[PDB]
Cytidine/deoxycytidylate deaminase, zinc-binding region
Amino acid sequence: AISDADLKYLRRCVDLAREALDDGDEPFGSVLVDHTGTTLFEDRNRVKDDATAHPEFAIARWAARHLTPDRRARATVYTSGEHCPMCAAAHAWVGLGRIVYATSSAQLGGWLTEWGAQAPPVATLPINTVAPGVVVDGPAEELAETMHNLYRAKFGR
Amino acid sequence: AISDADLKYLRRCVDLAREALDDGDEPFGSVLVDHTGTTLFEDRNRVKDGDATAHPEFAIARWAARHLTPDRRARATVYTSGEHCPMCAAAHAWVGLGRIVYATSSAQLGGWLTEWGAQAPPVATLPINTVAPGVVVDGPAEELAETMHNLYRAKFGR
Ligand SMILES: C[As](C)(=O)[O-]
Ligand SMILES: C[As](C)(=O)[O-]
Ligand SMILES: [Zn+2]
Ligand SMILES: [Zn+2]
């Protein structure tokens, strides 16, 4: 279930991923939203300015520092790309709520393989393999081509 | 695959885990050792201030990314009292660290929790190589099973 409201936030994730691309980083963007609708924190990949500089992970730590457990449980995380296992686990450790993603890690994995990219050193596990209790929605068919194009800009060869 | 020298570092990890439990934190301890046998960085769990991501293996991955070249990372070993959760195993692999040696597996931990009637963590106890297929992993250490059973029971089995 991805509503029109969820798509709007996913579009903002895509914009953040493009901000990252244009700054020399990798095209991953994410947004943290309170149950009450309000955007709490937005981020993107900052690999240039540690390979662990993932925005979803920054979200998890920001949430643990700024929000009570009750507010974390009720918050939603939107993301352009489905969390890697590092980030899915961090999300569950700090007790955040629903995740909605635009493109799956399986999708990205298949595209990387087409570009002849040597396999990343972390497996593309579905969020629920890592974090079984998290409610996960995605991918968003409307945004597949756009994300393919952003990924091609960074990782195509 | 567990040498005398490896076991000595695992005993240091256990001591770090005990330090953590005595300070109010969870009993997890880890040490980063370079290819010359020199300890570079030691750490322990620090979750009690409210950040459940304050794991020592993740601190080591970030420390290593800041302080070590890619070549030095690849040749360093991470010793740990408990096998890396998926968060920490992924971070380890993303930063390009080398071998991991652990005293107790995640299979041991998960089996003990269910023995004790304790709630499972919200992160699945995936073995390191499910998350990070290329990392060389050694453990667990039979010599340390009873100690770590006792230590995890103290924190998680009440
Ligand atoms: C979707 As990611 C590589 O920022 O965990
Ligand atoms: C063995 As652990 C919970 O510090 O990743
Ligand atoms: Zn990630
Ligand atoms: Zn961990």
